[PDB]
């Protein structure tokens, strides 16, 4: 009755992530002198290069090179030896107004609370009561690692360590009623950017004795835990120096590592008319609601929109067997108590504040209090 | 015991698309002359401009200028009046080496048959046995209705249209036994870029009876379907001139439409050492493979692997209740008759034959009998 699965995650400075980063940090810069911004910022980065590409109609007046090098500052990239300086890299700018045809077609002349979906599209939510933030204990392990990797490099305990990492947990689980128990951690891949004097043993020593035990509980590892430390033998070339990377490229490690499941959209460098991002927050917040409130042990919550439509095109509540009621009656408690509609969950989730760079590391979900993370009291 | 389930596509002229088909058309112009090209091409669009970005060693002499327009001529982007003209767009390329850290611990000096894993990475196949091909019925109609829309275009029965479309069904479906049964389509979503001379009337008429109808088989839709065609009531401006697109932001179009589950990574761009593309391939052959072999009805299968690592570190099976066989005994059965080695899956799936471009549009799965389509004879 056992099975494993695996989840990923990557740390601030993997390239995809770092592109994420910039994008909230556009977003953010906007919100905080117009709320209303409509953004749609896409960046690419590759060795020596930032590009922004998208959509921005804002009455803000953003200074892109200073925000997108202070986000690079803050991920760590600020020094040539790194393979990525702040200081000198290009910033290259390709942002245009929205198209005045989907300005017409979503908000212009519409009332903020019947405002209509940015786009098509469909999006998921999931809860499992397997961990106290409600997500699956793969991914939470999988982030923890990569912020442990961060604190150790910005403390000065491992100065050797580069902002560039990547992290991969496999665990054993038993099945129960359709919820899920994790019994012990089956396999950690860590492979981290490093300087060039550190040799592999140091590093991998380390990487156990002062990153895995110090995230993951030794309830879950034993003597035939496997452990792919530095498995590629040497990782001095990376950022995006190593690998090109571009924005909402870990759209899995954003959410729910391979658990529940996904309806494509990314979720950087959007405003909220955009239900790729806030509907996803809605849905969370659905999901984790009815786990919090005792209907069900895992859950999965899928809606979907038309551009223009206000109101949503389908909802759906999938329970995996984990609660008395059906599924047809924890949709109705869904429709008596959340308004799904943009106008709304704004409001509710408080999303003009310019708080989205701060999600787009570790997780969007299972952390920091964010509203859609605190769930709603339920009636019915 | 009845519920919703949606899923979206896109066409060959979406922004995202128009990426996908160019990162695979530079991908099969290697492999013509290098069938051992090690390639990781990201494309970005936007206004007037290709940019190509990523990694690739190979001993091909590829002209990206005109592998990158007659890709975009072939979608249908051939004058300023459409937004995009493959003749006088920019194509700008900043394509470097894999890094030689990634080569020497991947492939470097290493037998083809245990070859390394060219990333750490989670992997997901699903089949389904609700229509023939073994795909949902809500992606595969949403990539009919493109297909259509594409087909009437290029025909002339149509001249109104232009490349960029997208459309989303909704399917109310029955449960049976852990199997899903289609019953009928409860929405249909279709936005599709047009000339500047055509009514919306016009338009919508057509979309109902010239693409819905020939391609929706008449026991789905009924006097109850909802129908939301052209919603913004306007889409003359599209393509890169509309949206920036970005290789790999479609993944859920190009797999199940939200059924079954993704790890994360794109497929368009990459050679047969990067599992993201090569293991998800082989995941699908797999589970069509235990769907077409009578084993379940419905299956779910997970593998991981770990960068430099042949072996996959984790196979999972999930076959949603729809076997009399345990999930232990069908990965029993997976094992003795597959070998997910990436130097194993290059043989088996023929990934040296510069085919992919046929695959990066209209989803990966369910077509065109690919290796990967064609199951395999199980012995047990
Ligand atoms: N030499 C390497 N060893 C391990 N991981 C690497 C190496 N180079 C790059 N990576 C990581 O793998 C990703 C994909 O190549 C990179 O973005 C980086 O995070
Ligand atoms: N005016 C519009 N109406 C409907 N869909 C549109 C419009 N403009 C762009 N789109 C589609 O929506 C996507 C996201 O904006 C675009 O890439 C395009 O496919
Ligand atoms: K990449
Ligand atoms: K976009
Ligand atoms: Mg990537
Ligand atoms: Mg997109």
Not at 89 to 114: F, K, M, T, Y
């Given at each position: 009755?056992?099975?494993?699965?695996?989840?990923?995650?990557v740390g601030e400075g993997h390239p995809?992530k770092i592109?994420?980063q910039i994008?909230?940090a556009?977003?953010?810069?906007?919100?905080?002198?117009?709320?209303?911004?409509?953004?749609?910022?896409?960046?690419?980065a590759?060795?020596?290069?930032?590009?922004?590409?998208?959509?921005?109609?804002?009455?803000?007046?953003?200074?892109?090179?200073?925000?997108v090098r202070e986000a690079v500052k803050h991920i760590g990239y600020d020094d040539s030896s790194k393979g990525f300086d702040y200081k000198?890299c290009?910033?290259?700018?390709?942002?245009?107004?929205?198209?005045?045809?989907?300005?017409?077609?979503?908000?212009?002349?519409?009332?903020?609370?019947?405002?209509?979906?940015?786009?098509?599209?469909?999006?998921?939510?999931?809860?499992?009561?397997?961990?106290?933030?409600?997500?699956?204990?793969?991914?939470?392990?999988?982030?923890?690692?990569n912020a442990k990797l961060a604190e150790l490099r910005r403390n000065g305990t491992l100065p050797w360590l580069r902002p560039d990492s990547?992290?991969?947990?496999?665990?054993?689980?038993?099945?129960?009623?359709?919820?899920?128990?994790?019994?012990?951690?089956?396999?950690?891949?860590?492979?981290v950017q490093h300087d060039?004097?550190?040799?592999?043993?140091?590093?991998?020593?380390?990487?156990?004795?002062?990153?895995?035990?110090?995230?993951?509980?030794?309830?879950?590892?034993?003597?035939?835990?496997?452990?792919?430390?530095?498995?590629?033998?040497?990782?001095?070339?990376g950022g995006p120096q190593?690998?090109?990377?571009?924005?909402?490229?870990?759209?899995?490690?954003?959410?729910?590592?391979?658990?529940?499941?996904?309806?494509?959209?990314?979720?950087?460098?959007?405003?909220?008319?955009?239900?790729?991002?806030?509907?996803?927050?809605?849905?969370?917040?659905?999901?984790?609601?009815?786990?919090?409130?005792?209907?069900?042990?895992?859950?999965?919550?899928?809606?979907?929109?038309?551009?223009?439509?206000?109101?949503?095109?389908?909802?759906?509540?999938?329970?995996?067997?984990?609660?008395?009621?059906?599924?047809?009656?924890?949709?109705?408690?869904?429709?008596?108590?959340?308004?799904?509609?943009?106008?709304?969950?704004?409001?509710?989730?408080?999303?003009?504040?310019?708080?989205?760079?701060?999600?787009?590391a570790?997780?969007?979900?299972?952390?920091?209090?964010?509203?859609?993370?605190?769930?709603?009291?339920?009636?019915?």
């Amino acid at each position: 009755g056992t099975f494993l699965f695996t989840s990923e995650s990557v740390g601030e400075g993997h390239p995809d992530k770092i592109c994420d980063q910039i994008s909230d940090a556009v977003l953010d810069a906007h919100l905080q002198q117009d709320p209303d911004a409509k953004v749609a910022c896409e960046t690419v980065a590759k060795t020596g290069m930032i590009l922004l590409a998208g959509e921005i109609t804002s009455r803000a007046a953003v200074d892109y090179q200073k925000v997108v090098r202070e986000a690079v500052k803050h991920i760590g990239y600020d020094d040539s030896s790194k393979g990525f300086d702040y200081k000198t890299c290009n910033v290259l700018v390709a942002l245009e107004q929205q198209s005045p045809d989907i300005a017409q077609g979503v908000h212009l002349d519409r009332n903020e609370e019947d405002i209509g979906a940015g786009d098509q599209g469909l999006m998921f939510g999931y809860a499992t009561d397997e961990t106290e933030e409600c997500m699956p204990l793969t991914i939470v392990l999988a982030h923890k690692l990569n912020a442990k990797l961060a604190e150790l490099r910005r403390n000065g305990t491992l100065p050797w360590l580069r902002p560039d990492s990547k992290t991969q947990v496999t665990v054993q689980y038993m099945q129960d009623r359709g919820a899920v128990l994790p019994i012990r951690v089956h396999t950690i891949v860590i492979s981290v950017q490093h300087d060039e004097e550190v040799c592999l043993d140091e590093m991998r020593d380390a990487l156990k004795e002062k990153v895995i035990k110090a995230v993951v509980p030794a309830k879950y590892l034993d003597e035939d835990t496997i452990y792919h430390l530095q498995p590629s033998g040497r990782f001095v070339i990376g950022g995006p120096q190593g690998d090109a990377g571009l924005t909402g490229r870990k759209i899995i490690v954003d959410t729910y590592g391979g658990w529940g499941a996904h309806g494509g959209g990314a979720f950087s460098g959007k405003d909220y008319t955009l239900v790729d991002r806030s509907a996803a927050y809605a849905a969370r917040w659905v999901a984790k609601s009815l786990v919090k409130g005792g209907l069900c042990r895992r859950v999965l919550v899928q809606v979907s929109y038309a551009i223009g439509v206000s109101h949503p095109l389908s909802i759906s509540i999938f329970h995996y067997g984990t609660s008395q009621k059906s599924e047809r009656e924890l949709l109705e408690i869904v429709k008596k108590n959340f308004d799904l509609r943009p106008g709304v969950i704004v409001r509710d989730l408080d999303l003009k504040k310019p708080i989205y760079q701060r999600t787009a590391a570790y997780g969007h979900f299972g952390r920091d209090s964010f509203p859609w993370e605190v769930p709603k009291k339920l009636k019915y």
